[PDB]
Amino acid sequence: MKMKKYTKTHEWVSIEDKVATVGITNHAQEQLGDVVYVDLPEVGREVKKGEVVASIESVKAAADVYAPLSGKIVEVNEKLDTEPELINKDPEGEGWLFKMEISDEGELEDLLDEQAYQEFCAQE
């Protein structure tokens, strides 16, 4: 009833019922810093498990956030519109980027768990 997988692009997912809350992880805010902005999707767009629908420009850099599953966007974190620094604050608490209705909960297992993701950062 709670379920959290992770991607290869330092992003985490949060399935509860039918909606997966996305955010970038601590390893991501480490490279940008103080951000400046987030490029959030529209609250009704369809996406794939590799679609840059949550880009992050910063004070002078970028990061393409390639989405975790297919499914359709249905919430976005309007906090990050005005406090794009929230990924620093708690990347994996309130620095979430978007949410999407999942279609294929059978694809979650084919992504990385938390410790497998930690190890994926130990190969950088």
From Swiss-Prot:
Keyword check for Membrane: no
A single cellular component GO annotation: glycine cleavage complex
Residue numbers bearing the N6-lipoyllysine modification: K60
Pfam families xref list: GCV_H (PF01597)
GO BP terms, alphabetized: glycine decarboxylation via glycine cleavage system
UniProt-listed SUPFAM superfamilies: Single hybrid motif
Family, similarity comment: Belongs to the GcvH family.
Protein name in the entry: Glycine cleavage system H protein
Species this protein is from: Thermotoga maritima (strain ATCC 43589 / DSM 3109 / JCM 10099 / NBRC 100826 / MSB8)
Name of encoding gene: gcvH
